[PDB]
């Protein structure tokens, strides 16, 4: 991809004491046109990994097909494909990052930003980010696009360092993620009110909430704004 | 004349390819493997010869999976069976990539058949020393 066409906006995610949470709005924009609603941009890989993808939607579908075929090929000649030798978040992320860096080095990048979130076999939380340049990094909070400018400040208020992760309940993390999605809907011109969320916990399964909506929207004060300075009526 | 059985893809005066029949002999000397088509699916079974009790039980799996819906078992030279299963996995992968839906069982059967038959067209390659029972459930049952 030399120039993105149909794109998806911010993907946000954060760690908490028992796992990870990741959210992304269900919107595929065509330039400034909110063209495709109902675009799932969180891809669960098995039952312990969710890949959130932002950017070109065609490349996102390519990544989806790659993840499906990776799961399929991991099942081959592997009786522990449902047990010890199942696909780990770190494996999926390293594969994705290798692919992204190779595509970047061939001057034909997958125009995306990817956040791999999940829980390792030993219960450790995995939360890492790769992009079309091959740049990789991990943090207690991760976000792509506008989320990286607006959601990350709100989420770091909750989990500022590693020590704050064990103190963060899943309720606090989910509330922070939903508030960040609402703020993004407030101040991102290419965002959607409908979004999907995914919790990957070491004690419970993978919880995939779909068709969520930004609620509790503060718009009343807008009735008191008149003109752009000197207008009185 | 004579010497027809020394090279592959050579027709004997009775119209036979003796190298293929020798491959079938190699197949018949293999362990037993069966497949049963039922009303809504298929079952595959195989006998694994426990040469000694040093073999780790429940390991050394013989039944292989292609895509997520095709099962393949074979009798004969196990490595040739693994080779054929790898080829079939490539075929199923390419079919999924192009046509989106998982490969139907007749399509996969023809892929494997064309591969095995092509291995009987040239003297520079050896015929496959396996018999393969495979199948599964597609949109047609």
UniProtKB/Swiss-Prot annotation, chain A:
Q: Which family does it belong to?
A: Belongs to the peptidase T1B family.
Q: Where in the cell is it found?
A: Cytoplasm; Nucleus
* Protein name as it appears in the record: Proteasome subunit beta type-7
Q: Which Pfam families match?
A: Proteasome
Extract one GO BP annotation from the record: proteasome assembly
Q: Which domain of life is it from?
A: Eukaryota
List the GO cellular component terms: cytosol; nucleus; proteasome complex; proteasome core complex, beta-subunit complex; proteasome storage granule
Name the gene.
PRE4
Sorted keywords for this record are: Cytoplasm, Nucleus, Proteasome
Its biological purpose is as follows: Non-catalytic component of the proteasome which degrades poly-ubiquitinated proteins in the cytoplasm and in the nucleus. It is essential for the regulated turnover of proteins and for the removal of misfolded proteins. The proteasome is a multicatalytic proteinase complex that is characterized by its ability to cleave peptides with Arg, Phe, Tyr, Leu, and Glu adjacent to the leaving group at neutral or slightly basic pH. It has an ATP-dependent proteolytic activity. PRE3 and PRE4 are necessary for the peptidyl-glutamyl-peptide-hydrolyzing activity.
Q: How does it assemble?
A: The 26S proteasome consists of a 20S proteasome core and two 19S regulatory subunits. The 20S proteasome core is composed of 28 subunits that are arranged in four stacked rings, resulting in a barrel-shaped structure. The two end rings are each formed by seven alpha subunits, and the two central rings are each formed by seven beta subunits. The catalytic chamber with the active sites is on the inside of the barrel. Interacts with CIC1.
Curated annotation (Swiss-Prot), chain B:
- Any one Gene Ontology cellular component term annotated for this protein: nucleus
An annotated Gene Ontology molecular function: mRNA binding
Q: What else is known?
A: Present with 12000 molecules/cell in log phase SD medium.
Q: State which gene encodes it.
A: PRE10
Can you tell which superkingdom this protein's organism belongs to?
Eukaryota
Spell out the subunit comment.
The 26S proteasome consists of a 20S proteasome core and two 19S regulatory subunits. The 20S proteasome core is composed of 28 subunits that are arranged in four stacked rings, resulting in a barrel-shaped structure. The two end rings are each formed by seven alpha subunits, and the two central rings are each formed by seven beta subunits. The catalytic chamber with the active sites is on the inside of the barrel.
Q: What does this protein do?
A: The proteasome degrades poly-ubiquitinated proteins in the cytoplasm and in the nucleus. It is essential for the regulated turnover of proteins and for the removal of misfolded proteins. The proteasome is a multicatalytic proteinase complex that is characterized by its ability to cleave peptides with Arg, Phe, Tyr, Leu, and Glu adjacent to the leaving group at neutral or slightly basic pH. It has an ATP-dependent proteolytic activity.
State the UniProt keywords alphabetically: Acetylation, Cytoplasm, Nucleus, Proteasome
Q: Please outline how this chain is modified post-translation.
A: The alpha and beta forms are probably products of the same gene with different post-translational modifications.
Name of the protein in question = Probable proteasome subunit alpha type-7
Please tell me the species this chain comes from: Saccharomyces cerevisiae (strain ATCC 204508 / S288c) (Baker's yeast)
Which cell locations does it reside in?
A: Cytoplasm; Nucleus
This protein's record includes keyword Cell division: no
| Recorded family membership | Belongs to the peptidase T1A family.
One GO biological-process annotation of the entry reads:
proteasomal ubiquitin-independent protein catabolic process
